Design an enzyme around this catalytic site. Sequence first.
Site, PDB file in Angstrom:
ATOM      1  N   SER A  46     -10.691  -3.256  -0.903  1.00 31.07           N
ATOM      2  CA  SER A  46      -9.410  -3.586  -1.409  1.00 31.07           C
ATOM      3  C   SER A  46      -8.902  -2.849  -2.464  1.00 31.07           C
ATOM      4  O   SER A  46      -7.719  -3.059  -3.142  1.00 31.07           O
ATOM      5  CB  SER A  46      -9.849  -4.987  -2.368  1.00 31.07           C
ATOM      6  OG  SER A  46      -9.967  -6.064  -1.460  1.00 31.07           O
ATOM      7  N   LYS A  49      -5.298  -2.213  -2.324  1.00 24.35           N
ATOM      8  CA  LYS A  49      -3.989  -3.546  -2.624  1.00 24.35           C
ATOM      9  C   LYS A  49      -3.167  -2.893  -3.939  1.00 24.35           C
ATOM     10  O   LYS A  49      -2.152  -3.037  -4.125  1.00 24.35           O
ATOM     11  CB  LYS A  49      -4.943  -4.750  -3.098  1.00 24.35           C
ATOM     12  CG  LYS A  49      -5.292  -5.274  -2.013  1.00 24.35           C
ATOM     13  CD  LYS A  49      -6.754  -6.129  -2.002  1.00 24.35           C
ATOM     14  CE  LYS A  49      -7.037  -6.678  -0.768  1.00 24.35           C
ATOM     15  NZ  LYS A  49      -8.069  -7.976  -1.212  1.00 24.35           N
ATOM     16  N   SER A 107      -7.502  -9.566  -6.171  1.00 23.60           N
ATOM     17  CA  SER A 107      -7.902  -9.143  -4.745  1.00 23.60           C
ATOM     18  C   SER A 107      -7.611 -10.268  -3.627  1.00 23.60           C
ATOM     19  O   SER A 107      -8.518 -10.338  -2.885  1.00 23.60           O
ATOM     20  CB  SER A 107      -9.600  -8.745  -4.744  1.00 23.60           C
ATOM     21  OG  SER A 107      -9.621  -7.670  -3.909  1.00 23.60           O
ATOM     22  N   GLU A 143      -6.411  -7.569   6.344  1.00 20.00           N
ATOM     23  CA  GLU A 143      -7.611  -8.507   5.884  1.00 20.00           C
ATOM     24  C   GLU A 143      -8.034  -9.417   6.889  1.00 20.00           C
ATOM     25  O   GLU A 143      -7.268 -10.088   7.630  1.00 20.00           O
ATOM     26  CB  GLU A 143      -7.384  -9.085   4.494  1.00 20.00           C
ATOM     27  CG  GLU A 143      -6.780  -8.200   3.574  1.00 20.00           C
ATOM     28  CD  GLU A 143      -8.012  -7.428   2.920  1.00 20.00           C
ATOM     29  OE1 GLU A 143      -7.406  -6.497   2.078  1.00 20.00           O
ATOM     30  OE2 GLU A 143      -9.027  -7.454   3.166  1.00 20.00           O
TER      31      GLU A 143
END
EC number: 3.5.2.6
Length: 268
Positions: A46, A49, A107, A143
Amino acid sequence: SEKLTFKTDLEKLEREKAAQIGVAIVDPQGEIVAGHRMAQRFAMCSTFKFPLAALVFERIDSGTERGDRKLSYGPDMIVEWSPATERFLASGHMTVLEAAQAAVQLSDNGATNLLLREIGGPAAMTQYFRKIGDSVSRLDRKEPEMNDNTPGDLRDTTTPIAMARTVAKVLYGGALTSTSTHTIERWLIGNQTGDATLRAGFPKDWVVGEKTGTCANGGRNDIGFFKAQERDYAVAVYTTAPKLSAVERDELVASVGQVITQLILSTD
């Protein structure tokens, strides 16, 4: 000197925890301050991101995207850990800014995929890294599969050094307007997921902002910035500790925080 201790202390963690630790610390211009396996490839998880949010801001900056544009979705966009996406599900949309902030501060995986649907997918993410002078970091999947962290796999990786420099670019390097930069910086400071990681390891008077990452197969990462003694630093930490518990991985990244503090304090 400071350097050899830094290295020694990480190598001891690595040994005793059966872990690999990748670290890079740079100044606002991207000059190396300290590193460990700084060019070993590690799954991003993550941590990407954050750059995803920077890409979004760059498109807002340039007038090719709008922060308040409403992005509609249904239940198909919900993935594992999508706390804000699930909340907004009934309303039927999240704005571009809502999704970016949830991706960064929570997240939120669904919010991340919603953003990826809009910007052109992993290929576009990767293009942006190239645009900000990072030729190493690569997004190949969405994801949750981008977190598979298959041993040896170069998909969806970065190096502490490339990611450190990318962080520095977005925060200090002028990749975003002064307004976007400030906003994404506040977002990192107010991250909700990083309490037990790097910032647990830094002194309490440093302004710290960051984004965590967790992958399968023992991946635990944290990237961001801190300001210690009026100096600005960009940092990237990626760890692989397959046999440690999730809690101990948090603690390992915190311990790395400490080792970094020791280096920075001793540095002149």
